[PDB]
Design a protein around this nucleic acid. Structure first.
Ligand SMILES: [Zn+2]
Ligand SMILES: [Zn+2]
Ligand SMILES: [Zn+2]
Lengths: 156, 27, 80, 77
RNA sequence: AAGCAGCUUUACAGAUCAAUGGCGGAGGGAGGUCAACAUCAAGAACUGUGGGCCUUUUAUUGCCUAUAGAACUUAUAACGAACAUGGUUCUUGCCUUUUACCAGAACCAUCCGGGUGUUGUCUCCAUAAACAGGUAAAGCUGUCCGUUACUGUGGGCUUGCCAUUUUUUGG
Protein backbone atom coordinates (compact mmCIF):
# COMPACT_ATOMS: atom_id res chain seq x y z
CA UNK A 1 0.00 0.00 0.00
CA UNK A 2 1.21 3.49 0.90
CA UNK A 3 4.15 3.97 3.25
CA UNK A 4 3.64 5.12 6.83
CA UNK A 5 4.84 8.72 7.17
CA UNK A 6 4.59 11.56 9.67
CA UNK A 7 2.01 13.40 7.56
CA UNK A 8 -0.19 10.29 7.48
CA UNK A 9 -2.57 10.08 10.43
CA UNK A 10 -2.67 7.11 12.79
CA UNK A 11 -5.49 4.71 12.17
CA UNK A 12 -8.89 5.16 13.84
CA UNK A 13 -10.10 2.55 16.30
CA UNK A 14 -11.24 -0.74 14.82
CA UNK A 15 -8.37 -1.01 12.34
CA UNK A 16 -6.46 -3.52 14.46
CA UNK A 17 -9.54 -5.77 14.32
CA UNK A 18 -9.28 -5.94 10.52
CA UNK A 19 -5.48 -6.00 10.27
CA UNK A 20 -5.18 -9.83 9.81
CA UNK A 21 -7.22 -9.83 6.58
CA UNK A 22 -5.40 -6.83 5.08
CA UNK A 23 -2.11 -8.33 6.28
CA UNK A 24 -2.95 -11.62 4.54
CA UNK A 25 -3.66 -9.67 1.35
CA UNK A 26 -0.42 -7.74 1.89
CA UNK A 27 1.78 -10.82 2.28
CA UNK A 28 0.11 -12.46 -0.72
CA UNK A 29 0.94 -9.34 -2.75
CA UNK A 30 4.51 -9.56 -1.37
CA UNK A 31 4.69 -13.10 -2.72
CA UNK A 32 3.04 -12.19 -6.03
CA UNK A 33 5.31 -9.21 -6.79
CA UNK A 34 8.41 -11.39 -7.23
CA UNK A 35 9.12 -12.69 -10.70
CA UNK A 36 8.60 -16.41 -11.16
CA UNK A 37 10.19 -18.50 -13.90
CA UNK A 38 7.36 -17.19 -16.12
CA UNK A 39 8.64 -18.34 -19.50
CA UNK A 40 5.34 -18.53 -21.40
CA UNK A 41 3.11 -15.63 -22.38
CA UNK A 42 -0.25 -17.18 -21.50
CA UNK A 43 1.08 -17.85 -17.99
CA UNK A 44 2.90 -14.53 -17.79
CA UNK A 45 -0.44 -12.75 -17.91
CA UNK A 46 -1.88 -15.01 -15.19
CA UNK A 47 0.60 -13.65 -12.64
CA UNK A 48 -0.88 -10.22 -13.32
CA UNK A 49 -4.36 -11.69 -12.93
CA UNK A 50 -3.40 -12.91 -9.46
CA UNK A 51 -2.45 -9.36 -8.46
CA UNK A 52 -5.64 -7.94 -9.95
CA UNK A 53 -7.52 -10.62 -7.99
CA UNK A 54 -5.75 -9.69 -4.74
CA UNK A 55 -6.39 -5.96 -5.22
CA UNK A 56 -10.01 -6.70 -6.13
CA UNK A 57 -10.50 -8.87 -3.05
CA UNK A 58 -8.91 -6.29 -0.76
CA UNK A 59 -11.13 -3.52 -2.09
CA UNK A 60 -14.11 -5.91 -1.98
CA UNK A 61 -13.34 -6.66 1.68
CA UNK A 62 -13.23 -2.97 2.61
CA UNK A 63 -16.42 -2.33 0.60
CA UNK A 64 -18.07 -5.28 2.34
CA UNK A 65 -17.15 -4.08 5.82
CA UNK A 66 -18.22 -0.48 5.19
CA UNK A 67 -21.27 -0.47 2.92
CA UNK A 68 -22.63 -4.01 3.27
CA UNK A 69 -22.04 -5.01 6.90
CA UNK A 70 -21.69 -1.48 8.39
CA UNK A 71 -18.89 -2.34 10.83
CA UNK A 72 -16.24 0.23 9.86
CA UNK A 73 -17.02 3.87 10.67
CA UNK A 74 -16.63 6.75 8.23
CA UNK A 75 -13.35 7.86 9.83
CA UNK A 76 -11.68 4.47 9.41
CA UNK A 77 -13.04 4.07 5.89
CA UNK A 78 -11.74 7.50 4.89
CA UNK A 79 -8.38 6.53 6.41
CA UNK A 80 -8.36 3.33 4.34
CA UNK A 81 -9.19 5.49 1.32
CA UNK A 82 -6.35 7.94 2.05
CA UNK A 83 -3.83 5.14 2.58
CA UNK A 84 -4.82 3.51 -0.76
CA UNK A 85 -5.87 0.16 0.68
CA UNK A 86 -8.83 0.35 -1.73
CA UNK A 87 -9.61 2.47 -4.78
CA UNK A 88 -12.27 5.16 -4.63
CA UNK A 89 -13.29 4.32 -8.18
CA UNK A 90 -13.76 0.54 -7.84
CA UNK A 91 -15.85 1.03 -4.70
CA UNK A 92 -17.75 3.79 -6.50
CA UNK A 93 -18.56 1.51 -9.42
CA UNK A 94 -19.64 -1.09 -6.86
CA UNK A 95 -22.02 1.53 -5.45
CA UNK A 96 -23.63 1.94 -8.88
CA UNK A 97 -26.49 -0.18 -10.15
CA UNK A 98 -25.42 -2.85 -12.61
CA UNK A 99 -21.74 -2.76 -11.62
CA UNK A 100 -22.12 -4.40 -8.20
CA UNK A 101 -19.85 -7.29 -8.98
CA UNK A 102 -17.08 -5.98 -11.20
CA UNK A 103 -13.66 -7.18 -12.27
CA UNK A 104 -11.67 -3.93 -12.52
CA UNK A 105 -11.79 -0.42 -13.92
CA UNK A 106 -10.13 -1.45 -17.20
CA UNK A 107 -12.98 -3.72 -18.29
CA UNK A 108 -15.75 -1.11 -18.33
CA UNK A 109 -13.93 1.54 -20.39
CA UNK A 110 -15.11 1.83 -23.98
CA UNK A 111 -12.04 3.98 -24.68
CA UNK A 112 -9.53 1.11 -24.71
CA UNK A 113 -11.33 -1.54 -26.74
CA UNK A 114 -10.92 -1.55 -30.52
CA UNK A 115 -14.69 -1.66 -31.07
CA UNK A 116 -15.68 1.20 -28.80
CA UNK A 117 -17.58 -1.20 -26.54
CA UNK A 118 -16.98 -2.55 -23.04
CA UNK A 119 -15.10 -5.73 -22.27
CA UNK A 120 -16.41 -9.23 -22.83
CA UNK A 121 -16.37 -10.02 -19.12
CA UNK A 122 -19.23 -7.55 -18.64
CA UNK A 123 -21.45 -9.73 -20.82
CA UNK A 124 -23.43 -12.20 -18.66
CA UNK A 125 -22.62 -15.89 -18.90
CA UNK A 126 -26.20 -16.66 -19.93
CA UNK A 127 -25.94 -14.25 -22.88
CA UNK A 128 -22.73 -15.95 -24.00
CA UNK A 129 -24.48 -19.32 -23.74
CA UNK A 130 -27.40 -17.94 -25.78
CA UNK A 131 -25.06 -16.83 -28.55
CA UNK A 132 -23.21 -20.15 -28.32
CA UNK A 133 -26.52 -21.95 -28.78
CA UNK A 134 -27.47 -19.64 -31.66
CA UNK A 135 -24.13 -20.28 -33.37
CA UNK A 136 -24.01 -23.96 -32.37
CA UNK A 137 -20.52 -24.09 -30.85
CA UNK A 138 -19.53 -23.85 -27.19
CA UNK A 139 -18.87 -20.60 -25.34
CA UNK A 140 -15.55 -19.68 -26.96
CA UNK A 141 -14.52 -17.33 -24.12
CA UNK A 142 -12.82 -18.52 -20.94
CA UNK A 143 -10.50 -15.94 -19.34
CA UNK A 144 -10.54 -12.17 -19.81
CA UNK A 145 -7.29 -10.43 -20.71
CA UNK A 146 -6.90 -7.30 -18.54
CA UNK A 147 -7.85 -9.29 -15.43
CA UNK A 148 -8.55 -12.96 -15.07
CA UNK A 149 -12.28 -12.84 -14.36
CA UNK A 150 -14.32 -15.55 -16.08
CA UNK A 151 -17.49 -13.47 -15.91
CA UNK A 152 -18.04 -10.43 -13.74
CA UNK A 153 -21.38 -8.91 -14.68
CA UNK A 154 -23.76 -8.12 -11.86
CA UNK A 155 -25.95 -11.18 -12.40
CA UNK A 156 -23.23 -13.82 -12.78
CA UNK B 1 -32.96 -16.46 -20.78
CA UNK B 2 -33.05 -17.71 -17.20
CA UNK B 3 -35.19 -16.74 -14.24
CA UNK B 4 -33.67 -14.95 -11.24
CA UNK B 5 -33.86 -18.06 -9.07
CA UNK B 6 -32.18 -19.94 -11.92
CA UNK B 7 -29.45 -17.30 -11.99
CA UNK B 8 -29.12 -17.83 -8.23
CA UNK B 9 -28.81 -21.60 -8.60
CA UNK B 10 -26.38 -21.22 -11.52
CA UNK B 11 -24.04 -18.60 -10.05
CA UNK B 12 -23.43 -21.08 -7.23
CA UNK B 13 -22.27 -23.61 -9.83
CA UNK B 14 -19.08 -21.68 -10.60
CA UNK B 15 -16.41 -23.31 -8.50
CA UNK B 16 -14.65 -20.31 -7.00
CA UNK B 17 -16.30 -17.27 -5.48
CA UNK B 18 -16.12 -13.72 -6.76
CA UNK B 19 -15.58 -12.72 -10.39
CA UNK B 20 -12.71 -15.23 -10.63
CA UNK B 21 -15.03 -18.21 -10.11
CA UNK B 22 -14.45 -20.70 -12.89
CA UNK B 23 -17.22 -21.48 -15.38
CA UNK B 24 -14.97 -24.17 -16.86
CA UNK B 25 -17.06 -27.08 -15.44
CA UNK B 26 -14.52 -29.89 -15.17
CA UNK B 27 -16.48 -32.05 -12.71
CA UNK C 1 -58.30 54.40 -18.59
CA UNK C 2 -57.19 51.99 -15.84
CA UNK C 3 -54.95 51.73 -12.78
CA UNK C 4 -53.56 49.14 -10.38
CA UNK C 5 -53.77 49.26 -6.56
CA UNK C 6 -51.26 52.07 -6.31
CA UNK C 7 -50.03 53.50 -3.02
CA UNK C 8 -48.21 56.76 -3.82
CA UNK C 9 -46.96 58.91 -6.71
CA UNK C 10 -43.52 57.30 -7.07
CA UNK C 11 -44.71 53.81 -8.06
CA UNK C 12 -46.90 55.33 -10.81
CA UNK C 13 -44.03 57.33 -12.35
CA UNK C 14 -43.82 58.18 -16.11
CA UNK C 15 -47.57 57.55 -16.53
CA UNK C 16 -49.96 59.65 -18.61
CA UNK C 17 -51.02 62.18 -15.96
CA UNK C 18 -53.78 64.75 -16.18
CA UNK C 19 -52.85 67.63 -13.86
CA UNK C 20 -55.48 70.07 -12.61
CA UNK C 21 -54.23 73.58 -11.82
CA UNK C 22 -55.57 76.60 -9.95
CA UNK C 23 -55.79 78.78 -13.07
CA UNK C 24 -58.34 76.68 -14.98
CA UNK C 25 -55.65 74.89 -16.98
CA UNK C 26 -55.31 71.13 -17.46
CA UNK C 27 -51.87 69.73 -18.27
CA UNK C 28 -51.93 66.33 -19.97
CA UNK C 29 -48.85 64.24 -20.57
CA UNK C 30 -46.25 61.95 -19.09
CA UNK C 31 -44.08 62.51 -16.02
CA UNK C 32 -40.34 62.46 -15.31
CA UNK C 33 -39.69 63.96 -11.85
CA UNK C 34 -41.55 64.78 -8.63
CA UNK C 35 -40.72 66.36 -5.27
CA UNK C 36 -42.16 66.72 -1.77
CA UNK C 37 -44.24 69.68 -2.99
CA UNK C 38 -45.71 67.47 -5.79
CA UNK C 39 -43.51 69.47 -8.20
CA UNK C 40 -44.13 67.47 -11.34
CA UNK C 41 -41.64 67.77 -14.18
CA UNK C 42 -43.93 66.65 -16.98
CA UNK C 43 -42.43 64.77 -19.92
CA UNK C 44 -44.58 65.73 -22.95
CA UNK C 45 -46.73 68.53 -21.58
CA UNK C 46 -49.85 69.74 -23.38
CA UNK C 47 -51.58 72.73 -21.80
CA UNK C 48 -55.37 73.06 -22.02
CA UNK C 49 -57.00 76.44 -21.38
CA UNK C 50 -60.71 77.21 -21.76
CA UNK C 51 -61.35 80.85 -22.76
CA UNK C 52 -65.04 81.67 -22.48
CA UNK C 53 -66.29 76.12 -25.61
CA UNK C 54 -62.88 75.58 -27.19
CA UNK C 55 -59.93 73.82 -25.56
CA UNK C 56 -56.91 76.01 -26.33
CA UNK C 57 -54.22 73.36 -26.81
CA UNK C 58 -50.56 74.23 -26.30
CA UNK C 59 -47.36 72.25 -26.88
CA UNK C 60 -44.81 72.70 -24.08
CA UNK C 61 -42.57 69.64 -23.75
CA UNK C 62 -40.50 69.19 -20.58
CA UNK C 63 -41.80 71.62 -17.94
CA UNK C 64 -40.96 72.07 -14.27
CA UNK C 65 -44.21 72.85 -12.46
CA UNK C 66 -44.30 74.62 -9.10
CA UNK C 67 -46.47 72.59 -6.77
CA UNK C 68 -48.62 75.27 -5.11
CA UNK C 69 -50.17 76.04 -8.51
CA UNK C 70 -51.38 72.40 -8.74
CA UNK C 71 -54.77 71.27 -7.47
CA UNK C 72 -54.82 67.50 -8.06
CA UNK C 73 -53.47 64.86 -10.45
CA UNK C 74 -55.26 62.14 -12.44
CA UNK C 75 -53.74 58.84 -13.61
CA UNK C 76 -54.97 57.76 -17.05
CA UNK C 77 -53.09 54.79 -18.53
CA UNK C 78 -49.74 53.18 -19.31
CA UNK C 79 -46.89 55.01 -21.09
CA UNK C 80 -45.38 54.15 -24.50
CA UNK D 1 -19.93 11.81 -26.01
CA UNK D 2 -18.47 8.57 -24.62
CA UNK D 3 -15.48 9.01 -22.30
CA UNK D 4 -14.91 7.01 -19.17
CA UNK D 5 -11.78 8.50 -17.51
CA UNK D 6 -8.45 6.85 -16.98
CA UNK D 7 -8.28 3.70 -14.87
CA UNK D 8 -6.33 3.99 -11.63
CA UNK D 9 -4.41 0.71 -11.38
CA UNK D 10 -2.81 -0.96 -8.35
CA UNK D 11 0.92 -0.30 -7.85
CA UNK D 12 1.57 -4.04 -7.53
CA UNK D 13 0.54 -4.56 -11.16
CA UNK D 14 3.16 -2.05 -12.33
CA UNK D 15 5.68 -3.61 -9.97
CA UNK D 16 5.02 -7.11 -11.32
CA UNK D 17 5.43 -5.88 -14.90
CA UNK D 18 8.79 -4.28 -14.04
CA UNK D 19 9.85 -7.48 -12.25
CA UNK D 20 8.93 -9.70 -15.22
CA UNK D 21 11.09 -7.56 -17.53
CA UNK D 22 14.34 -8.42 -15.75
CA UNK D 23 14.85 -11.74 -17.55
CA UNK D 24 13.89 -10.63 -21.10
CA UNK D 25 15.08 -13.84 -22.73
CA UNK D 26 11.85 -15.41 -24.01
CA UNK D 27 10.50 -14.98 -27.52
CA UNK D 28 7.37 -13.28 -26.13
CA UNK D 29 9.30 -10.12 -25.27
CA UNK D 30 10.05 -9.43 -28.96
CA UNK D 31 7.36 -6.83 -29.57
CA UNK D 32 7.88 -5.70 -25.97
CA UNK D 33 11.55 -5.25 -26.80
CA UNK D 34 10.45 -3.22 -29.83
CA UNK D 35 8.56 -1.07 -27.32
CA UNK D 36 11.76 -0.51 -25.33
CA UNK D 37 13.59 0.83 -28.35
CA UNK D 38 10.63 2.94 -29.13
CA UNK D 39 10.41 4.36 -25.65
CA UNK D 40 13.85 6.00 -25.73
CA UNK D 41 12.45 8.86 -27.80
CA UNK D 42 9.97 9.27 -24.96
CA UNK D 43 12.51 8.50 -22.22
CA UNK D 44 13.93 12.02 -21.51
CA UNK D 45 10.50 13.60 -21.13
CA UNK D 46 9.95 11.20 -18.24
CA UNK D 47 13.25 12.37 -16.73
CA UNK D 48 11.81 15.88 -16.58
CA UNK D 49 8.70 14.38 -15.08
CA UNK D 50 10.85 12.88 -12.36
CA UNK D 51 12.88 15.97 -11.74
CA UNK D 52 9.89 18.29 -11.65
CA UNK D 53 8.23 15.98 -9.11
CA UNK D 54 11.46 15.62 -7.16
CA UNK D 55 10.64 15.37 -3.44
CA UNK D 56 11.58 18.46 -1.51
CA UNK D 57 13.60 18.37 1.74
CA UNK D 58 10.60 19.08 3.96
CA UNK D 59 8.76 15.95 2.77
CA UNK D 60 9.73 12.31 3.20
CA UNK D 61 8.37 10.72 0.02
CA UNK D 62 5.90 12.18 -2.46
CA UNK D 63 3.34 9.59 -3.59
CA UNK D 64 2.95 10.59 -7.21
CA UNK D 65 0.68 9.67 -10.11
CA UNK D 66 2.34 7.94 -13.02
CA UNK D 67 1.51 6.32 -16.35
CA UNK D 68 3.11 2.99 -17.14
CA UNK D 69 3.18 1.22 -20.46
CA UNK D 70 1.55 -2.23 -20.52
CA UNK D 71 4.91 -3.81 -21.32
CA UNK D 72 6.50 -1.63 -18.62
CA UNK D 73 8.68 0.06 -21.22
CA UNK D 74 8.52 3.68 -20.04
CA UNK D 75 7.17 5.11 -16.77
CA UNK D 76 5.99 8.72 -17.13
CA UNK D 77 5.38 10.45 -13.81
C1' A E 1 -30.44 54.77 12.27
C1' A E 2 -36.12 53.71 17.83
C1' G E 3 -41.73 54.22 15.73
C1' C E 4 -45.83 54.89 12.39
C1' A E 5 -47.83 54.88 7.09
C1' G E 6 -46.34 52.60 2.46
C1' C E 7 -43.82 48.71 -0.63
C1' U E 8 -41.59 43.85 -0.76
C1' U E 9 -40.77 38.98 1.53
C1' U E 10 -40.90 34.34 3.97
C1' A E 11 -43.30 31.58 8.58
C1' C E 12 -47.97 32.08 8.36
C1' A E 13 -53.78 33.10 10.88
C1' G E 14 -57.13 34.05 6.92
C1' A E 15 -61.90 35.10 0.88
C1' U E 16 -62.47 31.57 -3.37
C1' C E 17 -60.73 26.74 -2.53
C1' A E 18 -62.87 28.95 -8.98
C1' A E 19 -61.31 32.04 -13.87
C1' U E 20 -56.87 35.02 -12.89
C1' G E 21 -51.50 37.47 -12.14
C1' G E 22 -46.35 37.90 -10.15
C1' C E 23 -42.29 34.93 -8.62
C1' G E 24 -40.18 30.15 -8.61
C1' G E 25 -40.37 25.00 -11.31
C1' A E 26 -41.00 21.85 -17.50
C1' G E 27 -34.42 15.88 -14.80
C1' G E 28 -29.57 19.25 -8.81
C1' G E 29 -25.03 21.27 -5.84
C1' A E 30 -19.66 21.00 -4.76
C1' G E 31 -15.81 19.75 -7.07
C1' G E 32 -11.66 16.30 -10.15
C1' U E 33 -3.09 16.56 -11.53
C1' C E 34 -10.63 14.33 -16.14
C1' A E 35 -10.32 15.04 -21.84
C1' A E 36 -12.72 17.18 -26.11
C1' C E 37 -13.65 21.41 -29.08
C1' A E 38 -12.95 26.37 -29.68
C1' U E 39 -9.81 30.67 -28.20
C1' C E 40 -5.35 33.28 -26.58
C1' A E 41 -0.32 38.99 -30.16
C1' A E 42 -4.00 42.48 -32.53
C1' G E 43 -6.20 49.68 -36.82
C1' A E 44 -5.85 49.11 -28.69
C1' A E 45 -6.68 46.07 -31.17
C1' C E 46 -13.65 41.78 -30.33
C1' U E 47 -18.23 39.95 -31.77
C1' G E 48 -24.39 39.66 -32.16
C1' U E 49 -28.64 41.84 -34.74
C1' G E 50 -30.76 45.60 -38.25
C1' G E 51 -30.90 49.50 -41.88
C1' G E 52 -28.56 52.30 -45.68
C1' C E 53 -24.54 53.23 -49.36
C1' C E 54 -20.62 51.90 -53.63
C1' U E 55 -18.88 47.88 -58.40
C1' U E 56 -21.91 46.62 -64.03
C1' U E 57 -26.19 43.29 -62.07
C1' U E 58 -25.64 44.01 -56.20
C1' A E 59 -21.84 38.40 -55.97
C1' U E 60 -16.75 37.41 -51.95
C1' U E 61 -14.75 43.16 -50.56
C1' G E 62 -15.38 48.08 -47.68
C1' C E 63 -17.83 51.85 -44.83
C1' C E 64 -21.85 55.27 -41.70
C1' U E 65 -25.44 54.37 -37.75
C1' A E 66 -28.68 51.93 -33.74
C1' U E 67 -28.47 48.95 -29.41
C1' A E 68 -27.09 44.41 -26.60
C1' G E 69 -22.99 41.98 -24.88
C1' A E 70 -16.58 41.42 -24.81
C1' A E 71 -14.44 35.51 -20.78
C1' C E 72 -9.12 34.75 -20.85
C1' U E 73 -3.26 37.82 -21.23
C1' U E 74 -1.78 42.97 -21.89
C1' A E 75 1.84 48.57 -20.28
C1' U E 76 8.55 48.82 -16.66
C1' A E 77 2.89 45.67 -22.93
C1' A E 78 1.67 40.43 -22.36
C1' C E 79 -0.98 33.77 -22.13
C1' G E 80 4.14 31.58 -17.93
C1' A E 81 5.73 37.61 -12.28
C1' A E 82 9.35 31.40 -15.11
C1' C E 83 12.49 30.41 -19.15
C1' A E 84 15.01 26.34 -22.31
C1' U E 85 16.33 24.36 -27.30
C1' G E 86 16.70 23.84 -32.61
C1' G E 87 16.90 25.54 -38.04
C1' U E 88 18.49 29.19 -41.98
C1' U E 89 21.43 33.56 -43.07
C1' C E 90 25.06 37.36 -41.56
C1' U E 91 28.87 39.11 -38.33
C1' U E 92 32.72 37.68 -34.12
C1' G E 93 35.66 34.02 -31.15
C1' C E 94 38.08 28.79 -30.49
C1' C E 95 40.70 27.81 -34.27
C1' U E 96 43.20 22.15 -37.24
C1' U E 97 38.19 20.19 -40.67
C1' U E 98 33.21 18.81 -39.28
C1' U E 99 29.81 17.64 -35.41
C1' A E 100 29.94 19.63 -30.68
C1' C E 101 30.79 25.15 -30.11
C1' C E 102 31.96 31.08 -28.32
C1' A E 103 27.60 35.13 -28.84
C1' G E 104 25.22 38.65 -30.85
C1' A E 105 21.54 40.09 -34.70
C1' A E 106 17.43 39.02 -38.10
C1' C E 107 13.43 35.79 -39.60
C1' C E 108 11.34 31.48 -38.06
C1' A E 109 10.17 27.40 -35.32
C1' U E 110 10.24 23.07 -31.54
C1' C E 111 9.47 21.70 -26.33
C1' C E 112 7.84 22.21 -20.33
C1' G E 113 3.66 24.43 -19.51
C1' G E 114 -0.86 28.08 -18.66
C1' G E 115 -5.61 30.91 -18.75
C1' U E 116 -11.00 31.26 -20.15
C1' G E 117 -15.78 29.68 -22.25
C1' U E 118 -18.88 25.61 -23.66
C1' U E 119 -19.87 20.43 -24.13
C1' G E 120 -19.26 15.67 -21.96
C1' U E 121 -17.55 12.14 -18.46
C1' C E 122 -16.11 10.80 -13.37
C1' U E 123 -16.15 11.27 -7.80
C1' C E 124 -18.74 12.84 -3.31
C1' C E 125 -23.26 14.75 -1.21
C1' A E 126 -28.24 14.93 -1.77
C1' U E 127 -33.20 14.23 -4.48
C1' A E 128 -45.81 18.66 -10.55
C1' A E 129 -38.41 17.42 -11.74
C1' A E 130 -45.60 15.59 -15.55
C1' C E 131 -46.95 15.88 -21.32
C1' A E 132 -46.05 17.81 -26.41
C1' G E 133 -42.32 20.36 -31.03
C1' G E 134 -36.10 21.43 -32.32
C1' U E 135 -31.70 23.42 -33.22
C1' A E 136 -25.16 22.82 -32.71
C1' A E 137 -27.33 24.39 -27.11
C1' A E 138 -30.67 25.85 -23.00
C1' G E 139 -38.24 25.91 -18.79
C1' C E 140 -37.26 28.07 -26.05
C1' U E 141 -42.49 27.88 -26.38
C1' G E 142 -47.61 25.68 -25.60
C1' U E 143 -50.42 22.64 -21.71
C1' C E 144 -49.11 22.55 -16.76
C1' C E 145 -47.44 22.67 -10.64
C1' G E 146 -45.97 25.23 -5.41
C1' U E 147 -45.86 30.54 -2.21
C1' U E 148 -49.66 33.20 -3.85
C1' A E 149 -53.21 37.72 -6.66
C1' C E 150 -58.06 40.71 -1.39
C1' U E 151 -56.42 41.84 5.31
C1' G E 152 -53.28 41.34 10.26
C1' U E 153 -48.71 39.62 13.30
C1' G E 154 -43.49 38.77 12.36
C1' G E 155 -38.22 40.64 9.00
C1' G E 156 -35.80 44.15 5.15
C1' C E 157 -35.87 49.59 3.14
C1' U E 158 -36.35 51.91 -2.36
C1' U E 159 -39.23 56.53 0.87
C1' G E 160 -42.06 60.81 4.10
C1' C E 161 -42.46 62.85 9.23
C1' C E 162 -41.46 62.61 14.46
C1' A E 163 -49.32 78.20 9.65
C1' U E 164 -46.25 82.99 10.45
C1' U E 165 -42.82 86.12 2.35
C1' U E 166 -40.34 81.28 -1.74
C1' U E 167 -45.05 75.93 -2.27
C1' U E 168 -48.59 71.63 2.54
C1' U E 169 -52.29 74.87 6.84
C1' G E 170 -55.16 81.48 2.81
C1' G E 171 -55.67 87.22 -1.25
ZN1 LIG F 1 -14.45 -8.38 -15.75
ZN1 LIG G 1 -11.37 -6.32 -15.71
ZN1 LIG H 1 -12.47 -7.75 -19.11
Amino acid sequence: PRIKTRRSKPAPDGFEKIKPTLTDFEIQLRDAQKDKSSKLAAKSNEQLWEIMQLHHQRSRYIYTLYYKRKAISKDLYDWLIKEKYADKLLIAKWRKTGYEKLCCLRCIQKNETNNGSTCICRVPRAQLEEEARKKGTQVSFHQCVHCGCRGCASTD
Amino acid sequence: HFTKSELKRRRKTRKGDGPWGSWSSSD
Amino acid sequence: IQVAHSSRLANLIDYKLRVLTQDGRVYIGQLMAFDKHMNLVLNECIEERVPKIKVEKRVLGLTILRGEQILSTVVEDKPL
Amino acid sequence: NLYTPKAEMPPEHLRKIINTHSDMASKMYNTDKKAFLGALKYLPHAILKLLENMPHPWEQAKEVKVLYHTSGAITFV
